[PDB]
Amino acid sequence: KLGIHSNDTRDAWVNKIAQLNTLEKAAEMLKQFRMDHTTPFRNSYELDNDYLWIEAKLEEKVAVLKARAFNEVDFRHKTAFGEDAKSVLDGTVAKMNAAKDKWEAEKIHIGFRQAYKPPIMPVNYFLDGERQLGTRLMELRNLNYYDTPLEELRKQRGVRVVHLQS
Amino acid sequence: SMLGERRRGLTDPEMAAVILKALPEAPLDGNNKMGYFVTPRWKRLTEYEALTVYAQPNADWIAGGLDWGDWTQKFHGGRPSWGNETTELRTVDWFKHRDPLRRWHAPYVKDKAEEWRYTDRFLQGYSADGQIRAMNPTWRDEFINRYWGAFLFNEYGLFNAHSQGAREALSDVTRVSLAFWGFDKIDIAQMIQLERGFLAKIVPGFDESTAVPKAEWTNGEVYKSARLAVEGLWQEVFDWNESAFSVHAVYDALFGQFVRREFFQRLAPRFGDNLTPFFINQAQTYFQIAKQGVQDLYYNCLGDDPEFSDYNRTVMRNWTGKWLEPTIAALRDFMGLFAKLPAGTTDKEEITASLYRVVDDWIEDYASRIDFKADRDQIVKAVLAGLK
Amino acid sequence: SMLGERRRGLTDPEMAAVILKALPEAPLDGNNKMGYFVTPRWKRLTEYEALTVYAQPNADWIAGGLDWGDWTQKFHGGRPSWGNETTELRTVDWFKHRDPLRRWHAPYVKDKAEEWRYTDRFLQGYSADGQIRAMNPTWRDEFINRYWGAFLFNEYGLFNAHSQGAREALSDVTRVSLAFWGFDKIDIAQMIQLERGFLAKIVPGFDESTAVPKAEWTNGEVYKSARLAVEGLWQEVFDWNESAFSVHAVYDALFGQFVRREFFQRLAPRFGDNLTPFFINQAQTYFQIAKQGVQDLYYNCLGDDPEFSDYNRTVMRNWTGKWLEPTIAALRDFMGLFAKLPAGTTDKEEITASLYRVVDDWIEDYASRIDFKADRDQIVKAVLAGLK
Amino acid sequence: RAPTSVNAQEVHRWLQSFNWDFKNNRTKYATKYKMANETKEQFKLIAKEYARMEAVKDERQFGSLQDALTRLNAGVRVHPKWNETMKVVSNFLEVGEYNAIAATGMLWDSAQAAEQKNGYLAQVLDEIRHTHQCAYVNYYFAKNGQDPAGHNDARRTRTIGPLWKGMKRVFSDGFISGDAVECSLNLQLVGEACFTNPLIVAVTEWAAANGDEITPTVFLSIETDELRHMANGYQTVVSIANDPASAKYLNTDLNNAFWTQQKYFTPVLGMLFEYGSKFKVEPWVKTWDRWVYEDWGGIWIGRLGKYGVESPRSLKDAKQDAYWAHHDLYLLAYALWPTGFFRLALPDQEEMEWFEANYPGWYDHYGKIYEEWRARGCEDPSSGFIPLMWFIENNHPIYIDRVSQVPFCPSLAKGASTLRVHEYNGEMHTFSDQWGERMWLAEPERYECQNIFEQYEGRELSEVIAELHGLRSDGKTLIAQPHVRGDKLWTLDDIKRLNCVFKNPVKAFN
Amino acid sequence: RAPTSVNAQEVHRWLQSFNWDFKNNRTKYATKYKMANETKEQFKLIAKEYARMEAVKDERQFGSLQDALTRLNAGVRVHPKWNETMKVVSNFLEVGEYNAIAATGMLWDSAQAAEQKNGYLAQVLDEIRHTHQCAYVNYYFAKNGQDPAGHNDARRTRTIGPLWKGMKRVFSDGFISGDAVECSLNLQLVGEACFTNPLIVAVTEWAAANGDEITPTVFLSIETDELRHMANGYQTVVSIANDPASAKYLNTDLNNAFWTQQKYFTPVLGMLFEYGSKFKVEPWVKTWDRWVYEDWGGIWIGRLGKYGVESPRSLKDAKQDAYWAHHDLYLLAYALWPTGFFRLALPDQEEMEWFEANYPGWYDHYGKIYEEWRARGCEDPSSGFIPLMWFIENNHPIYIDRVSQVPFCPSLAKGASTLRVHEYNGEMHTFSDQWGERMWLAEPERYECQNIFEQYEGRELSEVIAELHGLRSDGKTLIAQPHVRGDKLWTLDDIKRLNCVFKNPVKAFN
Ligand SMILES: [Ca+2]
Ligand SMILES: [Ca+2]
Ligand SMILES: [Ca+2]
Ligand SMILES: [Ca+2]
Ligand SMILES: [Fe+3]
Ligand SMILES: [Fe+3]
Ligand SMILES: [Fe+3]
Ligand SMILES: [Fe+3]
């Protein structure tokens, strides 16, 4: 079974997700999944064709579990890991505003997403974070955007140049 | 020339013959129904559904999507164009919602257009019939110009609360309903100003400037907590569903309904004002129209979701508790307006009865739908403390 | 089949080629304006005039006609299809009249259609918003069901008064206006019943049957003289202009405007009734619409006729006196209604104020136009004699 | 607090109770019948719903006209002959729509039952819409067509010709002058059910065949309203059937109404269809028999038998006179072409073959005559020849029936050739059939319409035309023409030089 | 006491004052810019008047469609090729209209001045209108056309093919993902002003030429709303011009947006126009130059010079790469015909002559290729041949640009032949140009879109088509076809006979 919308990989993860019955275990698995399968900094590209869908299914479980475990105040203001959302948001923004360059900035923004994307951090704080972190990242990235030659930009990004044609 | 220079394949003999010759003997498929694969909400697929459902290019990783793969271009940082992360609510399918009134763009502007022309005829007939003669001067210059006027900012704020939703909604049916709910709010805000502009034309000395109503809204006491709530709902909420739900199923259902229906519409007639009720009537019609959509999305689709019913109700109960307090504060401050009315206009018993009507309607139409345990007498008691 | 069996000359290659081949190089006349010979009332000729003026095939012996000769077939006895003999008024041209609103069939039904759908939406919002909860039971079951209902027979009678005029009108522009004046009257009668039917649906024991309101009209005391005046204006007048003039410029301008605006409209709000006023709004907008047409025909055209100005004014001043008496009597009887109102609802100072507004508006819009010097104080006094 | 409203039917349920009893509550018009006060109507409409259902139609119609059709130049890509035909079809129908307003106003007054008055009222408003719709057709072709003259002023230029007189008899006076019931039969039972309804649909057919998509857009919309008018005519009979007078008068008023209507439409409609087009849809002989004998005379009338309604006693006579009627009339219409407000064309080779195929003997009579006139130069201004001259030269007087106003030429006609001339109190009268003759004998004062020969007697042709504005914009070229080509148009001077002076043909019997 | 009222402008005069100050009154979206708080809008509209003006347009539009156009069978009498082109043109435009709704919702949130928010709001409402209009075109052709398949389910069948991915980049994600200002440039200053506005007008011309009067009716109406959006775009620049950030970032965001839009439309539009039609209106080469260089790059951009706006630095590159771009792409679209939701046709004899005439050298390259594929039997189901096989046999790999999603075959193309392959953190990436390469290198996390080869790797073709519902109602015949004739349509089994299995072309690299 190797379909686009339905396949063995997806089935296997649905089974794996069905066994996460406590918030801490489920939230931890979601964060681990994001480190392992999302963004260009992911640990591997093995789940490239299904990770987006699988991540959503894992999110669903963490969400329902969090709503059942947290009281109303905590559901609004705490992360799934019990951290104070505002503190995390403010702390991350602080680091972002201190970032020395666009390279440090991209790591901060991307890492923040992998770690706190809802249902880990409440949506309100998370999108407020997107608003602030994204602004700085762009301000740093878009300054003198074309000054660096591609020959050198390839080195800065750290890609392995496999083939070139002209 | 009489015939023009451009030749059309439908009428040009040479071109049409070329076209006709290339045609098949019959259609290459007998299924002439666009959107035939959409699950109909009613007996048969509606034009509303065919033209709307699945227009949004969501992939399967956003519940209900038919596409596949990641977006082609995302935000700096990685945020997806549309994603599950923009709202706390979950569902098996974001395309399940249906506006009970089945409004796509054509039917929507058609009705509002009828209302615009009807309004123009009304004002002309009202002015030509000299009905302004029967309006109490104090009610007109104090309560309509200042207090009803100030309310336009409330509706304007609620309109603006929809901006993020227009951008983040996770489906076409929800985006369209959401856009129409917001559009009707700015329309009401503009109809309040329109009334003031009308009065400026038929009443010597009546100033249509918004300076007075705006100073009341921004610095007065009657609307202080109302403004604080609006500012929060609009700019402190980043979850498009928390915004639409809290605005329509909490704040506007309680504060909005009370101000429009239980204060201005209930009292205007007692001062020879048939003008304001004309517009409030539109606002109430719009309110009831939005209610149907709000109820379908939050109660029928999300609150009753086969997989996330329990979860979504827990979240909406959370939101109701969160926004009920600021809403009660808004009503409490508004109670201060009654002390400014001419003695004998109304009394504590009428005010209390009208509060209970709004609260009971709210419990029946909204709170009960998610099992929120509202205590009607405790809510009214908290509000009545604002009576001076 | 997919293409069908019928060949159309606009799209069929063979047939279109033949058509194209027969066409002239350019239009055979550059005057592409239908009705170019009609004298415009405004800057440029309007669609309203082009599509209406001269549609009626009158010969020159009927002031303004462009045709010649007698009618082809007349009534047994010799009576002409249309003739100067069907009305006392005379003019230099029966096609002079112009509806200020320039209403031909299309715009007319478009406006009424919008009003119908606006009305449907209003009722739906009213019922969903539970606004009926604020209406006084007595006013509802007594003054709305019986007395407002009874008034539907008044409007209905005024509608029927237009039947002969629809047949005898001496020009297209006058027939179209007359038809619309009458059509709006039966509409109002129907709206009165519609409201009673609406109440029947939302108020458990409310009976929509016309029995009660009909008995009041046929055997009641409040509308006795009103009914007698209506029975006369309709079946005792054989002059289409006398009927139209006397109905709109005398009876309905006084009695009608009082009962509608000065009684039900003015008092409904005090009883928590925002429903009745919604419909009366339409009746008033209609009255104002028909008024502009009535004024243009009897004053601008006939009253100020370059040749029969004095003559017509004499005839209209005559009709005014002839029907002012039955109209006064109609008001007097209606006065008895105020005694049935709950104590404290209204006093004599208000009644007198409303009566003067009607009479004054009448003198300002009609009486003064034809030099019918009327005594406002004498009128208000005669009517006032009907109170308790 | 469920959303609730009220519809037309729910209000209409109590409409019958709106009327109340009282002394003078009776019709103001002379009538031999008594319409039952308990008569009901088929459709349960109220003013507001009526407006909405019509407003929806207007939307589609005007939308198509102003947008797609205008973008397709639909007003231009129509056969010249059809552009001309629509000047007559639309304007002449317009007067029928217009007088129908006054007619139904008269019936509304006659009816005593509130519902019956309401039925007539709906038609009053419908006929107003149709008046404006027909007006819009001429308005549109004037604005966007190949020849605005006529389309732009038919309301006054139609008064010049003889065909207009007969149209007024069936579409104007026949609709409003007489017993209300007689008028109802002329308008609804006969006019609308037997002719207008079918005619309007047929016109959309011929229009489409000739490139005209403007007319179908408007006429098909008009057609959607006719069901209510059919109902009115039918209910007119139902409302008087239980009255004694009915058995004594109905069939007589009906027969007179049938003869009246058919007298004009039989020759005129066939003429407009077959001679006012290039592409043909169906032979008029076949159409007529179906409409009159099958559809109306059979099915429609048949259903009213239970109400004492019988087939017009003049039906067979009508069929006898019908066959060559339209062919005989076009000869006269073309001979008098200078009196019209439209351009006429002679049959081309394909058409003559079509006429002969469908009407054996057509060529030996009409065909040879048209070719004779053409070779003589009837289409050329410098020829100095107008077919009217041929009629004088060959002693073929053209008369106008005193009752129907229909032109007839007994000495040349292939169809009916009967002629009755009478003198009464110093005035001569010419009749073309036994039914019309009776009408005049029994009702002399109902028919005093002066004919064109009487009004124009002693007048020179170009003078009548000039006076009645039969000219195009340039003030010199005639609106009417003997051909439909763009060149060599006749001018007022071309006519003046002929020195044609009208004479009253009846005076020859003096 | 005279009839008086109030209009839109009178109320709008006070709209700017509707917004008020408070600590948190600020946009919720990340942005490098600051839109001036006193920014004004060009049109003084309010909700009520907006609805009226649009309602009037709908009336004319739908009236034409439901009435006259349907009566004329306008949905059928269109060239087969154009019926297919509209499946793509209308549904692809639909997504642009749709995302523009969200885009302007985002811009409405960004603007702080009430008037500027209001301008964006009008567009929000217009794009909903346009979404439903494009939907209606497909809806109409499905209901009344020669081939409903595709028109009736594009919302899901579009997901099978590679062209859709690139459409989402410029018409979906490009419109809503990034700095609100960057999004505004992609949507309004570049997208609408340079491409969509001109594109919409052009389509009505090509449609009319190919017998399609349905699209002109809708698109011409859509076009009437664009004035407001152009103004929004212009005002975006004005609103941020006085901010220091503008001088630092504006031209960079503008250049990126220009390259983004152009990269897709340059090859795709020219392809749809020339290869998706029978009758040609104008050679894409001249059309493109006028639109991009003259109209947009010259006039439009020139007016913004006063605000610091400069001509995109990548303009020259775009032109050089533009000449053969659409021709290069059709070769790929046809070879991958089984992955579409529309039927394609090989250029016919008359067309090849037109191509060669307008693009010297076309025949020696593309012509011969098509002739070879034809000989191989690419149109016949029993051939067991699909052009894709030809690419394999001649070692011509097809890659997918990681950024624009535009397919390219560098070893065969007559235009751009550049190819850059990088490996990064365990993933391979292929780029077709230096602008898209910089975008990925600088913003890796913005471009992770998986391509069809990555998703379909190791999958047999017929299974992908079946899985994604690429079949007609008979459940066997493919929606897509290698020819537009009514007979010999390929079925799923014919594609299965073939045994085509996808492979990721980048895996060849070590
Ligand atoms: Ca306070
Ligand atoms: Ca009390
Ligand atoms: Ca309690
Ligand atoms: Ca390797
Ligand atoms: Fe009619
Ligand atoms: Fe009729
Ligand atoms: Fe658009
Ligand atoms: Fe746009």
Q: Which residue has the tokens 């009458």?
A: C182
Q: How many CB atoms lie within 10 A of CB B119?
A: 20
Nearest CA to D61 out of C258, E66, E288, B341 is that of E66
Using DSSP's 3-state secondary structure scheme, residue C346 falls into: coil
Structural domain including B346 reads: 1-388
Q: C30-42 b/e with 16+ CB inside 10 Å = b? A: ebbbbbebbeebe
CB < 8 Å to B236, chain A: 124
Contact B177, B99 (CB under 8 A): yes
Contact D400, D162 (CB under 8 A): yes
C-alpha angle C343-C348-C350 in degrees, rounded to nearest 5: 100
Residues in chain D: 510
Contact B262, B354 (CB under 8 A): yes
Residues carrying CATH 1.20.1280.10, chain A = 2-69
C-alpha distances in angstroms, E139 versus B26, B34, B177, D359? 18, 5, 21, 49
In whole angstroms, give the CA distance from residue C255 to residue C154: 10
Using DSSP's 3-state secondary structure scheme, residue A166 falls into: coil
According to DSSP, the residues that pair with D430 across neighbouring strands are D421
Q: Which residue has the tokens 């609620």?
A: B158
Contact E447, E431 (CB under 8 A): no
> A36: Cβ–Cβ under 8 A, 6 or more apart, which residues?
A42, A43, A44
Say which DSSP state E157 is in: H
Tokens, residue B98: 């249906």
β pairing state of E407-408 and E399-400: antiparallel
CATH number for the segment(s) A70-142:
1.20.1280.30
Residue E85 CB-half CA count within 13 A:
27
Phi-psi region of C78 (alpha: psi -120 to 50; beta: other; left: phi over 0): left
In whole angstroms, give the CA distance from residue B59 to residue A50: 11
C-alpha distances in angstroms, B155 versus B260, B289, E115? 11, 16, 16
D87 exposed, middle or buried (CB, 10 Å; 0-12, 13-18, 19+)?
A: buried
In whole angstroms, give the CA distance from residue D137 to residue D139: 5
Q: How many CB atoms lie within 10 A of CB E500?
A: 17
Q: Is residue E49 a known part of a binding site?
A: no
Q: Chain B within 8 Å of E32 (Cβ-Cβ)?
A: no
**Which experimental method was this entry solved with?**
X-ray
| Chain breaks in chain C following residues, C–N > 2.5 Å | none
According to DSSP, the residues that pair with A61 across neighbouring strands are none
Q: Which residue has the tokens 């009673």?
A: C196
Contact C363, C376 (CB under 8 A): yes
User: Most distant CA pair in chain C: distance in Å?
Assistant: 86
Contact C336, C386 (CB under 8 A): yes
Nearest CA to E78 out of C17, B22, D74, D211 is that of B22
Amino acid, single-letter form, for residue A109: H
In whole angstroms, give the CA distance from residue C120 to residue C278: 12
Q: Chain C within 8 Å of B236 (Cβ-Cβ)?
A: no
Contact A75, A124 (CB under 8 A): no
Tokens, residue E346: 């090989």
Secondary structure E strands in D91-160 = none
Tokens, residue E165: 């991915």
Contact D142, C27 (CB under 8 A): no
Q: How many CB atoms lie within 10 A of CB B295?
A: 18
In whole angstroms, give the CA distance from residue B178 to residue D281: 55
CB C3 to CB E76 under 8 A?
Answer: yes
Q: Which of D128, D168, D171 to mutate to test the interface with C (most CBs of C within 10 A)?
A: D128
In whole angstroms, give the CA distance from residue E64 to residue C328: 55
**Is the torsion defined by CA of C302, C304, C306, C307 positive or negative?**
positive
Contact A5, B60 (CB under 8 A): yes
For E72, which of C2, C11, C288 is closest by C-beta distance? Answer: C11
For B16, which of E5, E77, E131 is closest by C-beta distance? Answer: E77
User: End-to-end distance of chain D based on CA atoms, in angstroms?
Assistant: 87
Distance from CA of residue E75 to its chain's centroid?
A: 23
| Chain breaks in chain E following residues, C–N > 2.5 Å | none
C-alpha angle C264-C266-C271 in degrees, rounded to nearest 5: 75
In whole angstroms, give the CA distance from residue E330 to residue E345: 10
In whole angstroms, give the CA distance from residue D342 to residue E162: 62
Q: Chain C within 8 Å of B281 (Cβ-Cβ)?
A: yes
CB < 8 Å to C3, chain E: 73, 76-77
Q: Which residue has the tokens 């979950």?
A: B90
CB C36 to CB D208 under 8 A?
Answer: no
C-alpha distances in angstroms, D402 versus A29, D392, D396? 104, 21, 18
Q: How many CB atoms lie within 10 A of CB C139?
A: 23
For D59, which of E63, E213, E216 is closest by C-beta distance? Answer: E63
Using DSSP's 3-state secondary structure scheme, residue D407 falls into: strand
Question: Chains C, E: CB contacts under 8 A, how many?
Answer: 12
CB D69 to CB E71 under 8 A?
Answer: no
Chains E and A touch (3+ CB pairs under 8 A): yes
CB < 8 Å to B33, chain E: 142-143, 148, 152
Using DSSP's 3-state secondary structure scheme, residue D429 falls into: strand
Using DSSP's 3-state secondary structure scheme, residue D254 falls into: helix
In whole angstroms, give the CA distance from residue D271 to residue D351: 13
C-alpha distances in angstroms, B176 versus B105, B182, C382, D501? 8, 10, 62, 76
Tokens, residue A1: 């079974």
Nearest CA to E110 out of E196, E178, E47, E12 is that of E178
Contact B231, B266 (CB under 8 A): no
Q: Which ligand is nearest to the CA of B333?
A: 1
Using DSSP's 3-state secondary structure scheme, residue A88 falls into: helix
In whole angstroms, give the CA distance from residue D103 to residue D176: 5
**Is the torsion defined by CA of D97, D101, D102, D103 positive or negative?**
positive
Using DSSP's 3-state secondary structure scheme, residue E419 falls into: strand
Residues carrying CATH 1.20.1280.30, chain A = 70-142
Q: Chain C within 8 Å of B22 (Cβ-Cβ)?
A: no
Contact D264, D162 (CB under 8 A): no
Contact D118, D50 (CB under 8 A): no
How is domain A2-69 classified at the architecture level of CATH? Up-down Bundle (1.20)
Nearest CA to E137 out of E85, E215, E73 is that of E215
Three-state SS across D451-491? CHHHHCCCCEHHHHHHHCCCECCCCCEECCECCCCCCCCCE
Domains and CATH numbers, chain E: 1-510 (1.10.620.20)
Tokens, residue C348: 């004599």
Three-state SS across chain B? CCCCCCCCCCCCHHHHHHHHHHCCCCCCCCCCCCCCCCCCCCCCCCHHHHHHCCCCCCECCCCCCCECCCCCCCCCCCCCCCCHHHCCCCCCCCCCCCCCCCCCHHHHHHHHHHHHHHHHHHHHHHHHCCHHHHCCHHHHHHHHHHHHHHHHHHHHHHHHCCHHHHHHCCCHHHHHHHHHHHHHHHHHHHHHHHHHHHHHHHCCCCCCCCHHHHHHHHHCCCCHHHHHHHHHHHHCCCCHHHHHHHHHHHHHHHHHHHHHHHHHHHHHHHHCCCHHHHHHHHHHHHHHHHHHHHHHHHHHHHHCCCCCHHHHHHHHHHHHHHHHHHHHHHHHHHHHHHHHCCCCCCCHHHHHHHHHHHHHHHHHHCHHHHCCCCCHHHHHHHHHCCCC
Residues around the ion ligand 5 (C-beta < 5 A) = D 97, 130
Tokens, residue E53: 């003006």
Instruction: Provide Rg for chain C, Cα atoms.
Output: 25
CB E64 to CB D61 under 8 A?
Answer: no
β pairing state of E427-431 and E419-424: antiparallel
Q: Which residue has the tokens 């009613």?
A: B42
Question: Chains B, E: CB contacts under 8 A, how many?
Answer: 356
Residues in chain C: 388
Contact E276, E81 (CB under 8 A): yes
Distance from CA of residue E316 to its chain's centroid?
A: 22
Phi-psi region of B102 (alpha: psi -120 to 50; beta: other; left: phi over 0): left
User: The CATH number of the domain where B12 resides is what?
Assistant: 1.10.620.20
The tally of domains found in chain C comes to: 1
**Orientation angle between helical segments A85-98 and A102-116, nearest 10 degrees:** 170
Nearest CA to E11 out of B198, B336, B57, C60 is that of B198
Chains C and A touch (3+ CB pairs under 8 A): no
Contact C16, C9 (CB under 8 A): yes
In whole angstroms, give the CA distance from residue B318 to residue A71: 9
In whole angstroms, give the CA distance from residue B54 to residue B40: 13
CB A56 to CB B62 under 8 A?
Answer: yes
Distance from CA of residue E451 to its chain's centroid?
A: 18
Using DSSP's 3-state secondary structure scheme, residue D408 falls into: strand
Nearest CA to E469 out of E198, E180, E201, E158 is that of E158
Nearest CA to C156 out of B125, D129, D16 is that of D16
In whole angstroms, give the CA distance from residue C82 to residue D177: 9
